[PDB]
Amino acid sequence: PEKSKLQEIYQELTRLKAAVGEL
Amino acid sequence: PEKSKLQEIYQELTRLKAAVGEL
Amino acid sequence: PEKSKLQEIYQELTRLKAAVGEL
Amino acid sequence: PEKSKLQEIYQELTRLKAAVGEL
Amino acid sequence: PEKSKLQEIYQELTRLKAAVGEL
Amino acid sequence: PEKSKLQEIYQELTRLKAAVGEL
Amino acid sequence: PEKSKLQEIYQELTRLKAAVGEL
Amino acid sequence: PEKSKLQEIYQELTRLKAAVGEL
Amino acid sequence: PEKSKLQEIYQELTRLKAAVGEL
Amino acid sequence: PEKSKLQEIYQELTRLKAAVGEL
Amino acid sequence: PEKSKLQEIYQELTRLKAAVGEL
Amino acid sequence: PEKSKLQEIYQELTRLKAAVGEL
Amino acid sequence: PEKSKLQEIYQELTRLKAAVGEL
Amino acid sequence: PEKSKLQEIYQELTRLKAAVGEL
Amino acid sequence: PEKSKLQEIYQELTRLKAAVGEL
Amino acid sequence: PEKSKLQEIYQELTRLKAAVGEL
Amino acid sequence: PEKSKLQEIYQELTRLKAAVGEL
Amino acid sequence: PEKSKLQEIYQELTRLKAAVGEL
Amino acid sequence: PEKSKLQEIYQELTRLKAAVGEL
Amino acid sequence: PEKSKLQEIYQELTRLKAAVGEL
Amino acid sequence: PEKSKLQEIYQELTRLKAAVGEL
Amino acid sequence: PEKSKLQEIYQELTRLKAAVGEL
Amino acid sequence: PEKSKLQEIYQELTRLKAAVGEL
Amino acid sequence: PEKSKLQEIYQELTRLKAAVGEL
């Protein structure tokens, strides 16, 4: 597992948090 | 921790993003 | 990072998916 | 990948779970 | 927002429809 | 809460508007 | 969609029910 | 369910309240 | 306005029709 | 109260007007 | 249509009944 | 039932009151 | 004006007709 | 009181006028 | 037609009856 | 029954009173 | 003038006719 | 009193006038 | 014809009866 | 019976009174 | 003048005729 | 008294006049 | 003819009877 | 019987009285 993978996971979570905040 | 684990995590996030987009 | 950490992360995602399915 | 990264991921999930519980 | 809220809204509408039908 | 619920609510309102227009 | 929205919808319905009861 | 749906529901209620006030 | 009001109006008219028929 | 009620009231008035015109 | 309208109609009928009783 | 209906009813009553006053 | 009044008028006329027939 | 009553009264008066004219 | 009219008619008849009784 | 009828009746009575006064 | 008056007049004439017939 | 009575009176007077003219 | 006329006629007859009784 | 009849009767009596006064 | 007077006159004439017949 | 009586009286006088003329 | 005439006639006859009784 | 008859009778008596006065 590489650093760039966890970043991409973290970045998805961020975009999921923002979507819920628009519900 | 192996690569296939983070993929499965990433893949779940994807299916969570899609579900919220149908709310 | 240890295996048990990614499992706990995966398990949280699971419980988040189920909550959204009850919205 | 370091321990502090998975913690930050876990912590985001936590704050996402709480937001959905307020929907 | 939870399921029980939309039900209570739907149930009010129902009782409003019935009242108008008695006018 | 799912999309089909708000539709059913919207559809009831529609039939309530039409009933009042016949008073 | 937030909780305060469905409340405002519910509250309008309430004031509509009361108006019809004065017809 | 999206924000624009509850608005459209709220807006219908408004036009229903106004119609009853003309009875 | 309620159903019982229009009935009472209709019933008065009836008793007015009968009175004129005795003139 | 329904449309057909006010019509029946209006129709009675009509027949009362005609009776008085024969006095 | 409002309550005060049917009252005013009912009140006119009353004064019409009384006039006929003086014929 | 609409406002214009009760007005037309009220207006007929008026013309009935005037006719009786000419008897 | 009531029925019994015109009868009393008619009845007087009758008794006037009979008186003239005795002149 | 009906039209036919006043006619019968008027008709009696007529026959009373004619009788006096033969005195 | 008003009550006072039939009275005046009745009163004339009375004075006609009395005149014939003096013939 | 109309006003003009009772007048015509009253007017006949008048002409009957005058005829008797010439007997 | 009453019937009994003209009879009394007629009866006097009769007794006058008889008196002249004895002249 | 009827016309035929005064005629019979007048006719008697006539026959009385004629009798005196033969004295 | 009035009462005072027949009296005056009756009174003349009386004075005619008395004159014949002096022949 | 009319006024002119009793006058003609009265006038005959007058001419009968005058004839007797010439006997 | 009465019948018995002319008889008494006639009777005197008779007794005058008889007296002359004795001259 | 009748005409034929005075004639019979006149006729007696005539026959009395003639008797005296023969004395 | 009046009473005083027949008396004067009767009185003449009387004076004629007395004259013949002196022949 | 008329005045002129008794005069003619009276006048005859007069001429009878005068004739006797010449006997």
Residue numbers in the entry:
A (entry chain A), B (entry chain A), C (entry chain A), D (entry chain A), E (entry chain A), F (entry chain A), ...: 1 to 23
What does the paper say about this structure?
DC-SIGN (dendritic-cell-specific intercellular adhesion molecule 1-grabbing nonintegrin; CD209) and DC-SIGNR (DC-SIGN-related receptor, also known as L-SIGN and variously designated CD209L and CD299) are glycan-binding receptors of the immune system. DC-SIGN is expressed on dendritic cells and some types of macrophages, while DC-SIGNR is expressed on sinusoidal endothelial cells and in the placenta. Although each of these receptors binds mannose and related monosaccharides, they have differing specificities for oligosaccharides and for surfaces of microorganisms. Both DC-SIGN and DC-SIGNR bind high mannose oligosaccharides found on viral envelope glycoproteins and can participate in viral infection either directly by facilitating viral entry into a target cell or indirectly by presenting viruses to target cells. The CRDs in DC-SIGN and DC-SIGNR tetramers are projected at the ends of extended neck regions formed from a series of conserved but not identical sequences of 23 amino acids.
Further truncated forms were generated by removing the N-terminal non-repeat region or by removing this region and the first half of the first repeat unit. Gel filtration suggested that the purified truncated fragment is tetrameric, and differential scanning calorimetry demonstrated that it retains the stability of the full-length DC-SIGNR neck region, with a melting temperature of 81.7 °C compared with the measured value of 80.1 °C for the full-length neck. The structure was determined by multiwavelength anomalous dispersion phasing using crystals soaked in Pb(CH3COO)2. Within the unit cell, four molecules interact around the crystallographic 4-fold axis to generate a four-helix bundle. The four-helix bundles are translated by various numbers of repeats along the c axis throughout the crystal. This arrangement produces a unit cell with an asymmetric unit one repeat long that is an average of six nearly identical repeats. The model was further refined in Phenix to 2.2 Å. Completely conserved residues were given occupancy of 1.0, and side chains at the non-conserved positions were built with occupancy assigned based on their frequency in repeats 2 through 7: proline with occupancy of 0.83 and serine with occupancy of 0.17 at position 1 as well as glutamate with occupancy of 0.17, glutamine with occupancy of 0.33, and arginine with occupancy of 0.5 at position 15, resulting in the final refined model described in Table 2. The structure of the neck unit representing repeats 2 through 7 of the neck of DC-SIGNR is predominantly that of a four-helix bundle. The sequence of amino acids in the helical portions of the repeats follows the expected heptad pattern, with hydrophobic amino acids at the a and d positions. These hydrophobic residues are positioned toward the center of the bundle and pack against one another.
